[PDB]
């Protein structure tokens, strides 16, 4: 079985810090392209970041410079260093597999809640 | 330069062809006037000093990629083409040239001769070239030279068809590497007509001085380039 | 067969132009690679196997008393392997071609109506190619000097139809190749000729060029006319310093005679006792 | 920026009827870099189609994508009760990694 399991969410005050951790089973993330996708309440999906199997990490401007994505080869678990939080950052954060061959995302995780409120 | 740009068929992006261009004079003014290139990007070199600067060696890297994948040819920019097939250094002092060739590199039944490197083990160090068609071990089971699950061929073929859109049309790309380490690579430099019975400043094969340049009826041996007098000062020079 | 090569009067071979500059009725001295004059080598070709690998060192003057084209090419490089990038010289019937690549080197390559075309077997990893003009009482003479100065390889040629005769002949620049790689070793190879086999009568010279200075005289047209070593004899030193062949009768300063530092001795007060 | 526009925003149809969704890009996409998803309330998005024509693993053949350039369209030959949910289209640009998603379409039981 190949599935992802997000973790590390919770309630955080504005300006706080977090680190999401979603593990992978049946797939080696180091060899694949990997992205974070969140869903604001009652809104469409907003792409957060993508990390290449080559290591290059790119971000959307709404989250650029504040966040940092990393990867641990010893545990096959994803990271997304969450920092400098503002209110609309409250969303359900999915990390999901990029198929390669450009533009497809099949294997999604169940989703974890992140709430940014005082 | 023409043989690289006007070649019939280019090598694919993964096995891009490196041609050493040296011991000749550059004519980059044609490339700007060409106006037939879809992409004309020069990062480390500006056109003002480009045509009148000397470099140790210049190499002609040429290949064929897709329209959407032209943009990854940029220092700092990475991706599926700029990490596994050909990576520019982030200090890329040079030019990036690309143009559409859906006329040549597109067959009605599907031009599957231009391939890339889709999935490589790691990223590439500078001046590293992965031409290995080694079957990927994408799991734990070793690949005994045979295809199957967790055993894939690291080279996939482009779907070049004429019906495809702008981004899938074959865009022929030529990159001329500019580097300096002896200066056998120069530009036009403009060979200006000489004068007579006037002491002026001259540039004869890299030699400069002031003195009248008049007719002379001496016959010197062909191999010797220029002469000198008793006081070692130059007295004559051969114009090419 | 190992044999200490004989030596004879090499006379005044190997004198070459420093550069492409014309000079007239003047004398210029250059501190470059030069071979000693009247120096210490005359080879022979007489089952019998003589393939000496002479390291290139700082300079080699490789002449060739050759007729009917036995000498074909030499092997150049540092290790002469596909691990490094090597240099090779061949002169086929069509042209003269110099290459830089990584081929397979046959240990004993030779030639054999002909319908047998076995000249090469494969070409794996090449990076650049080069093509040049076709170069082609002893009647035939061919002179060649090998230099790698700042990574530039130069070949000089001369052919003047004439106890080995004493004479002068300048060496004329043809091609400067900026190889940019070191050269330290080379070896000469030959070819097999068939009219029960006969070996042609020929001999090759090997000297060695080391840093010294000469006195190059140029005629009114710009031809190297004479040459003298700076440190051949006191007469040579005299002409070298005074900058003239026609040195008059007189006493001249040449240099200072050093003493040789025989060894270094250092003495201190010390204490010695075998302590158990 | 290549904005994806979905149409309609709401499509109320009965089970067994054919659903048709159109996702139009603001620019001519390079030969169908489109990914298609199923998202149900309280559940993560589920990919169906990649390349705007090829179905993924475990995807019923009743779904079929079609499109090129700017316009890309889903056809659902038969609507089933488990298919009724919110739907997003997705594209990929190259120079920015633009994972732009469409506004969405809510298909309801009629
Ligand atoms: C192609 O060949 C023409 C000769 O007609 C030459 O002028 C031109 O420069 C060549 N193309 C390029 C891109 O240089």
Numbering used by the authors:
A (entry chain D): 1 to 9, 11 to 30, 35 to 59, 63 to 72, 74 to 110, 112 to 128
B (entry chain B): 338 to 518, 521 to 579
C (entry chain C): 22 to 61, 63 to 68, 77 to 142, 153 to 176, 185 to 210, 215 to 247, 257 to 337
D (entry chain E): 1 to 30, 36 to 57, 65 to 72, 74 to 80, 83 to 110, 113 to 127
Task: List sentences quoted exactly from the publication behind this structure.
The spike glycoprotein is the major target for neutralizing antibodies, which makes it a key candidate for both vaccine development and immunotherapy. The most potent antibodies tend to target the receptor-binding domain (RBD) of spike and interfere with the binding of RBD with the human ACE2 receptor.
JE-5C, JH-8B and JM-1A belong to Class 1/2 and their footprints locate around the ridge of RBD, heavily overlapped with that of ACE2. JH-8B has a high potency against WT strain (IC50 9 ng/ml) but a marked lower potency against BA.1 (IC50 142 ng/ml) than JE-5C, and the activity was regained against BA.2 and later subvariants. The antibodies showed varied levels of neutralizing potency against Omicron variants BA.4/5, with three Class 1/2 mAbs, JE-5C, JH-11A, and JH-8B, being most potent with half-maximal inhibitory concentrations (IC50 values) less than 0.1 μg/ml. But JH-11A was the only one with high potency extended against XBB.1.5 and XBB.1.16 (IC50 less than 0.1 μg/ml), while JH-8B had slightly reduced (IC50 around 0.2 μg/ml) and JE-5C had much reduced activities (IC50 over 1 μg/ml).
